[PDB]
Amino acid sequence: SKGEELFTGVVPILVELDGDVNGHKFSVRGEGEGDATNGKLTLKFICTTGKLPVPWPTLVTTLVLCFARYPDHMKQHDFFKSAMPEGYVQERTISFKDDGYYKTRAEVKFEGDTLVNRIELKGIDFKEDGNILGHKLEYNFNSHNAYITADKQKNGIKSNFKIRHNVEDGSVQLADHYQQNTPIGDGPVLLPDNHYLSTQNKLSKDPNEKRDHMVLLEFVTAAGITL
Incomplete structure (x- = not known):
C-alpha cells in the first residue's frame, strides 16, 4: 500500500487515554516511538491523574498495530498501514473472567509526523477486592498471538484473542478481547487473508520517575502465511 511508505523509519508515537472504570476517572499519557521494520515499540506511560486505578498490564493492549512487522511476502495483508495516514478506528470489548469488562474506542492516525492513538475507555461491573480494582495482577505480560480476519462488510478487520494475566497467588485472570477496526478515510485499504x-511485551519502571507509570517494550510480528 501507499501507507506503508510512512513506516520505513522510526516514527514518534503519542498515546492519550481517558478512562472511567466503575466511575473512577483517570488519564494516561504515553510517548515513545515505533519501527515497523523490526516491529519494535518503546513507550513510557504516566497516569496523569494520580495512581492508576486499574493494573497497568490490563491496559497494554488498549494503549498501535500499524507498527507490526509484516514480512515482505505478507505486505498485501497489512490493513493497518494501508489505512494510513487518515487512520482507523479500533474498538474493543475486553471481558475479565469473573469480573467486569472494558469497552474501548480509539482513533489511530497521523497528526503531523507523529502517530497518535487516542482512546476513550469505559469499565463497568468490576468487583470490589477483585483482581482489577484490588491490583492483584503481577507486573508482567505474557507473550501471545492474535488472529486477524477480514471483515469485508465493514471494510475492515476483526480479531478475538485471550490474554492471560498472572495473579499474585499463582492463578490466572483471563481477559477475552473482541476487536474491530474500520478505516477513517474512504480510500482503498488492504483486506487480509487470515493470519496472526x-x-x-516487557514491562519495567523508570527509577527516576515518581509518578505511577509503565515503561513498555513491545515487539509485534505478523505470521501465518507461507511463501
Whole structure:
C-alpha cells in the first residue's frame, strides 16, 4: 500500500487515554516511538491523574498495530498501514473472567509526523477486592498471538484473542478481547487473508520517575502465511 511508505523509519508515537472504570476517572499519557521494520515499540506511560486505578498490564493492549512487522511476502495483508495516514478506528470489548469488562474506542492516525492513538475507555461491573480494582495482577505480560480476519462488510478487520494475566497467588485472570477496526478515510485499504500477530511485551519502571507509570517494550510480528 501507499501507507506503508510512512513506516520505513522510526516514527514518534503519542498515546492519550481517558478512562472511567466503575466511575473512577483517570488519564494516561504515553510517548515513545515505533519501527515497523523490526516491529519494535518503546513507550513510557504516566497516569496523569494520580495512581492508576486499574493494573497497568490490563491496559497494554488498549494503549498501535500499524507498527507490526509484516514480512515482505505478507505486505498485501497489512490493513493497518494501508489505512494510513487518515487512520482507523479500533474498538474493543475486553471481558475479565469473573469480573467486569472494558469497552474501548480509539482513533489511530497521523497528526503531523507523529502517530497518535487516542482512546476513550469505559469499565463497568468490576468487583470490589477483585483482581482489577484490588491490583492483584503481577507486573508482567505474557507473550501471545492474535488472529486477524477480514471483515469485508465493514471494510475492515476483526480479531478475538485471550490474554492471560498472572495473579499474585499463582492463578490466572483471563481477559477475552473482541476487536474491530474500520478505516477513517474512504480510500482503498488492504483486506487480509487470515493470519496472526505475534506479540511480546516487557514491562519495567523508570527509577527516576515518581509518578505511577509503565515503561513498555513491545515487539509485534505478523505470521501465518507461507511463501
